[PDB]
Swiss-Prot record:
The active site is at 1 (schiff-base intermediate with dna), 2 (proton donor), 53 (proton donor). One of its GO terms (molecular function) is class I DNA-(apurinic or apyrimidinic site) endonuclease activity. Ubiquitous. The keyword ATP-binding does not apply. Involved in base excision repair of DNA damaged by oxidation or by mutagenic agents. Acts as a DNA glycosylase that recognizes and removes damaged bases. Has a preference for oxidized pyrimidines, such as thymine glycol, formamidopyrimidine (Fapy) and 5-hydroxyuracil. Has marginal activity towards 8-oxoguanine. Has AP (apurinic/apyrimidinic) lyase activity and introduces nicks in the DNA strand. Cleaves the DNA backbone by beta-delta elimination to generate a single-strand break at the site of the removed base with both 3'- and 5'-phosphates. Belongs to the FPG family. It comes from Homo sapiens. This is Endonuclease 8-like 1. The chain holds residues 2 to 290 of 390 of the full protein. Its EC number is 3.2.2.-, 4.2.99.18.
DNA sequence: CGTCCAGTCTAC
DNA sequence: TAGACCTGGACGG
């Protein structure tokens, strides 16, 4: 997913796992090329936070748990189909690539990273990807400064629709959000990035925060349906531009589809 | 059947 | 930059 989905998944893990105790090893599916998580505890709690298009899990063993184990942090990226689900241990979804198992007492559940297409990745260590900019949701002011301070970067030579996907400057912005953000201001997607950003040193950088914040405020699971069909309908109904009838579409330089109304902009193919 | 469509990562 | 990495749903013949 994108910022909203990573943020809501994070909120999901914290609520679902608040009163759960995990035990044992962390199991990876045999087909997954991500690394084995070397971690075992008779009794540990799981928590989460999001930053842009990444989510950090913390595995925190209870007082006196065995084996001797310090807390462990994993950072996840979701690629095109990543997701977290809490399921019954015997009813694992089809592409559950990493699993944390509840300990007795109560019914035996699995917290699962589910990723159909396996573009998602996880790293040992809890470090954010170096080079990703601050979170458009949780680090707005730092994110804003990081863009205005670096408009000289050749990243801003590109059309604004391409620039908005560069995770060094818009960590959390993906394909639906660039369409919804540029539609709110009727900025041609192939206006030059530097041209639209120089003019501001509710604007484009403010909406990079407020638009995805709207997806989060729906409750539900953004571009997702872990919360039901109702919350997915609510998301489709919030969209004004992305995939919507009557809207134009072009391929950017990297073959990604940009949705917009009216003027393509000067740098259009 | 078949084609086409839905965010990094890295080899040229 | 262009292709690689994947699975499944939508749609066409």
């Amino acid at each position: 997913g994108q910022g909203p989905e990573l943020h809501l998944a994070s909120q999901f893990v914290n609520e679902a796992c608040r009163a759960l105790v995990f035990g044992g090893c962390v199991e990876k599916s045999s087909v997954s090329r991500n690394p084995e998580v070397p971690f075992e505890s008779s009794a540990y709690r799981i928590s989460a936070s999001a930053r842009g298009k990444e989510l950090r899990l913390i595995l925190s063993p209870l007082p006196g748990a065995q084996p001797q184990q310090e807390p462990l942090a994993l950072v996840f990226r979701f690629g095109m189909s990543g997701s977290f689900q809490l399921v019954p241990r015997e009813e694992l979804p089809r592409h559950a690539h990493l699993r944390f198992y509840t300990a007795p007492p109560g019914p035996r559940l699995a917290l699962c990273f589910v990723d159909i297409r396996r573009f998602g990745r996880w790293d040992l260590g809890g470090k954010w990807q170096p080079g990703r900019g601050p979170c458009v949701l949780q680090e707005y002011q730092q994110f804003r400064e990081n863009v205005l301070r670096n408009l000289a970067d050749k990243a801003f030579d590109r059309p604004i629709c391409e620039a908005l996907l560069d995770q060094r400057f818009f960590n959390g912005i993906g394909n639906y959000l660039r369409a919804e953000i540029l539609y709110r201001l009727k900025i041609p997607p192939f206006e030059k990035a530097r041209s639209v950003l120089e003019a501001l040193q509710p604007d484009l950088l403010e909406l990079c925060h407020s638009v995805p914040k709207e997806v989060v405020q729906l409750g539900g699971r953004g571009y997702g349906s872990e919360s039901g069909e109702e919350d997915f309908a609510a998301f489709r109904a919030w969209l004004r531009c992305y995939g919507m009838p009557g809207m134009s579409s072009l391929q950017d330089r990297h073959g990604r589809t940009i949705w917009f109304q009216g003027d393509p902009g000067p740098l259009a193919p």
